[PDB]
Design a protein around this ligand. Sequence first.
Ligand code: HEM
Ligand code: NH3
Length: 184
Amino acid sequence: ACTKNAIAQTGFNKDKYFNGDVWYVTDYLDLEPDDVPKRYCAALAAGTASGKLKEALYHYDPKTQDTFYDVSELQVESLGKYTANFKKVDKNGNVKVAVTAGNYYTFTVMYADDSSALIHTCLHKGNKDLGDLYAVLNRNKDAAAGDKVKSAVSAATLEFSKFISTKENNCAYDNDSLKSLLTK
Ligand code: HEM
Ligand SMILES: [N]
């Protein structure tokens, strides 16, 4: 179960974050550790499409090759805090698993600048028991976490040394699919 009410960044700039571009997960912290594999690739695009706030997600397990995309129209709880009812899609936006009640994630932007971000997410999916997941994002898939985002990790009373990097998984991403999924 999730346990954190993450606080959104003071002064969060929504239009800059939701600009239609891609964010890569470089490091993550799962509070229920073997909730998720130790090795993993994830990325997202976030933007407004025809007036609607959207995210597109990509997950890839580099060992099993398990791959999935999702798209969601995000609902606002407060500035920097969203609820996302997701639908599983192929890379072209064709629906594989439709939106349903109880399949949603929350999404809190704790820190962001033009290049980096720290988010909290709580996933709800059917009758699964899932915990809090923090992710360090960068616009550059190979970027080491810098001082702004690492300080934000500290300010959240987290230890960056506990985060797991995604950099040794040889992750390769279809940025075009993520951008185009925002419209779907
Ligand atoms: C970037 C932020 C992230 C968001 C918003 C997010 C969101 C989601 C969503 C919505 C699903 C369900 C998709 C579906 O069933 O269609 C999912 C599944 C999953 N995510 Fe993430 N995720 C993120 C990052 C990660 C990372 C970094 C890992 C790390 C290992 C991860 C591991 C998983 C796993 C293992 C599942 C499968 C859950 C299951 O069905 O048992 N996610 N995630
Ligand atoms: N996740």
